[PDB]
Amino acid sequence: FVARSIAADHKDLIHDVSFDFHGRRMATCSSDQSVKVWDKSESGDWHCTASWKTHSGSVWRVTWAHPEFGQVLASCSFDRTAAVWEEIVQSHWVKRTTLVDSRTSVTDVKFAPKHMGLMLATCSADGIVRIYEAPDVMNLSQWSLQHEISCKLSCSCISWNPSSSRAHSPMIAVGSDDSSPNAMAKVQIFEYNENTRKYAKAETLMTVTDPVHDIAFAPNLGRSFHILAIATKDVRIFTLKPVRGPTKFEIHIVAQFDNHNSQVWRVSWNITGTVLASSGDDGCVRLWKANYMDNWKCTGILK
Amino acid sequence: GSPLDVLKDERVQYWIENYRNLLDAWRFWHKRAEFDIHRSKLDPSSKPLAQVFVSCNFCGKSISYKVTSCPGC
Amino acid sequence: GPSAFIPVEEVLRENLAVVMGLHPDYFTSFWRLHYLLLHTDGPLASSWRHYIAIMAAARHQCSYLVGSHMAEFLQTGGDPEWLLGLHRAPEKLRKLSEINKLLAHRPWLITKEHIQALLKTGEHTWSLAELIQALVLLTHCHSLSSFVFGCGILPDMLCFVEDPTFGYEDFTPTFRAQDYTWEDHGYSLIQRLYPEGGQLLDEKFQAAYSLTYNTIADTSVLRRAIWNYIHCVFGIRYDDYDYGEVNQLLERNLKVYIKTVACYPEKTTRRMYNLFWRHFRHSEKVHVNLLLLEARMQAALLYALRAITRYMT
Ligand SMILES: [Zn+2]
């Protein structure tokens, strides 16, 4: 493995980088209140294409949407809002809407899987998470609010479940962050209940007490169960098997990795969903893979 | 350099049409295309070929002047 | 002629749009506001905006705006079946009629409980960005409905209203004027929830507030009188103004005219129009009958924004 340093030309901390659907574009954001888009070239070089200002607060998580709807982005910032920026044909990015409903700063925003239309979820610091929908696909300005859930605790991360089957109802994971010495769980699972058309309470991870800092669902591609990842002070991987109200689950723990000797900040899966990645305060990136017998082991250390 | 009275004659159009047909016999397609560019830029009266335009299924009207969205409705 | 109240010769010397053309700046600003509100893409659909305009104009019985608006609602993909009545309307605007009541008749009963019930979880819910457009639309349409009768412009409904015998009450928890003002407090909130709407409203408000009056026996005192009197009609009391000048600066004919226009605009008549200030020019009677919509809109917006601000505090 080799590295290629890229001139960020930012004025503050970069928070997230997200990749395009086809892997040729990537978007960056920072607490300097801006968003930049880089595209790869013929000689594998990266150069900037757009450097416009988006919000008036520190810009957190920035995501890409499926190009079936066009080249449409999203973002959240210290401004208690959320945007649905779009690129139109020289070309430039123009705003389409601004969802302003939360009294506290919005932390994370994640697009839904394709097979349920165009949706958008945002978690707020006060503990409210809300799902939006845009039934009129061709104009990304008629956004509507469909559901609202209360988490009874601060919200820090959100992750959708990409299971494309019709035997899995949609489900969303909520990552808490409160550090108050009162124990209690952090991660919770919310499951759609199409019988009643509302999101219910499915399961709650009781074995998680330390602050959760990032969360992620594993791509399925054919798997018959669900795999979860959690970015606590350690790295944990969970397995959830539905038994044939919400469905009843079986929660097992597979990995209890603690060779970062630090606080784990991020987690990220692959496309085929067989290798995991994570970064901690130590400063390097680890890769974990299964040794064909439900026995994970480290397969590289990138720094 | 023809003022718009000579070009309207039934004779001055027949020669151009017959030359174009002769060019068709040559199978000199691209030469004919270039000559058509020339004639069109030097003779406003000529109306180009009549071809197909596609039409929407809901509006019912033409799309020829969101990009993905139709301009009708 | 466009109007049966103003002579055609006067209009020629100086379908209802041409009437407002005698004022250039305000014609431009109003046309800009109308274009952004009803035609540009935004949080709501075009059909819903036209329906909102319809329901906000079918409140003063303005059989001019409940016209073209339904005549252009159909040509925008709207449902023809909806015009049978609100009973045929979807259960998404049914929550809007109760607040449409007081936004045209009795503004002072608005409070947190009304907006909260509007922003209530269920199978048909609004967001902030998609109800702030609705309330601005309703206020704009009420103001236009007042002004059109204020110029008496010459070019079913009862099946569109709930309890159509409401009306406006004279008046007598007053609204203190310089406690929540537009130029300091409300502008920030409307701009945050609606950036372009705030700027266009701002331009309209200062453009209307820079017009002169010419014929006077200091064309500012009568302006302030006609500006604050309509405000205290609604409940906002400016403490600084000395209110003797209100009665001492406007003829009782002017007062009855402005009350008839702003309260029950269907009650104005040609005799009612001409009975005040016959020795003037009609643009002078237009610049006065044309600022009342602005004052009405200002008061309505201030009350609505005071109602909404308490919901977040
Ligand atoms: Zn069409």
Are C209 and C243 in the same domain? yes
Q: How far apart are CA B2 and CA B11, in angstroms?
A: 14
- Residue at C271 is within a domain: yes
Are C66 and C123 in the same domain? yes
User: Which residues, 6 or more positions from A262, have their beta carbon under 8 angstroms from its beta carbon?
Assistant: A233, A280, A281, A282
Place of tokens 């165009």: A118
Instruction: Tell how far CA A240 is from the center of its chain.
Output: 19
Structure tokens at B16: 């151009």
> Residues lining ligand 1 (ion), CB within 5 A?
B 56, 59, 70, 72
Which of C192, C310, C312 to mutate against chain A (most A CBs within 10 Å)? C192
- Residue at C129 is within a domain: yes
- What's the CA-to-centroid distance between A235 and ligand 1, angstroms? 54
Q: How far apart are CA A194 and CA C97, in angstroms?
A: 31
- Residue at C185 is within a domain: yes
Chain B touching partners, 3 or more CB pairs below 8 A: A
- Dihedral (CA of A39, A45, A50, A56) sign: positive
Structure tokens at C66: 């409940």
- Dihedral (CA of C284, C286, C290, C292) sign: positive
With an 8 Å Cβ cutoff, are B66 and A89 in contact? no
Tell me the domain boundaries of chain A.
1-242+250-303
Structure tokens at C311: 């919901």
Q: Which residues is A111 bridged to in the sheet?
A: A120
Q: How far apart are CA A251 and CA A243, in angstroms?
A: 11
Name the interface residues of A facing C (CB cutoff 8 Å). 97-101, 103, 136, 139, 141-145, 148
Burial of B4 from C-beta contacts in 10 A (0-12 / 13-18 / 19+): exposed
Q: Which residue of A has its CA nearest to B69?
A: A138
Are C141 and C185 in the same domain? no
Q: Is C141 a catalytic residue?
A: no
Are C195 and C105 in the same domain? no
Are C109 and C26 in the same domain? yes
Alpha-helical (H) ranges within C7-127 are 8-13, 24-38, 46-57, 65-73, 97-102, 112-118
Q: Order across the sheet with A46-50: list the strands.
A: A14-19, A25-30, A34-40, A46-50
Are C235 and C189 in the same domain? yes
Q: Which residue of A has its CA nearest to C193?
A: A100
Whether residue A71 contacts residue A87, with contact meaning beta carbons closer than 8 Å, is answered with yes
Closest CA to C249 of C286, C217, C273: C217
H-helix or E-strand spanning residue C240: none
Looking at the structure of chain C, the number of domains it has is 2
CA angle B47, B51, B53 (to 5 degrees): 120
- Residue at C261 is within a domain: yes
Q: How far apart are CA C264 and CA C57, in angstroms?
A: 14
Are C144 and C188 in the same domain? no
Closest CA to C145 of C28, C16, C281: C16
As a 3-state breakdown, chain B gives helix, strand, coil percent values, each rounded to 5, of: 40, 5, 55
Written as one letter, the residue type at C246 is: V
Closest CA to C115 of C291, C103, C106: C103
Q: Which parts of chain C are beta strand (E)?
A: 175-176, 236-237
Structure tokens at B61: 């009207």
Domain housing C235: 177-313
Q: How many CB pairs under 8 A join A and B?
A: 8
- Residue at C6 is within a domain: no
- N-to-C CA span, chain C: 52
Whether residue C253 contacts residue C276, with contact meaning beta carbons closer than 8 Å, is answered with yes
Task: Write the CA distances from C60 to A186, C103, C267, integer angstroms.
Answer: 56, 11, 10
Are C181 and C132 in the same domain? no
Are C189 and C255 in the same domain? yes
Catalytic residue among C62, C141, C151, C232: C62
Whether residue A107 contacts residue A60, with contact meaning beta carbons closer than 8 Å, is answered with yes
User: Which residues, 6 or more positions from C112, have their beta carbon under 8 angstroms from its beta carbon?
Assistant: C307, C310, C311
Q: How far apart are CA A163 and CA A170, in angstroms?
A: 8
Are C91 and C187 in the same domain? no
Counted residue by residue, chain A has a size of 303
Q: Which residues is A189 bridged to in the sheet?
A: A173, A203
Whether residue C238 contacts residue C231, with contact meaning beta carbons closer than 8 Å, is answered with yes
Task: Give the method used.
Answer: cryo-EM
- Residue at C23 is within a domain: yes
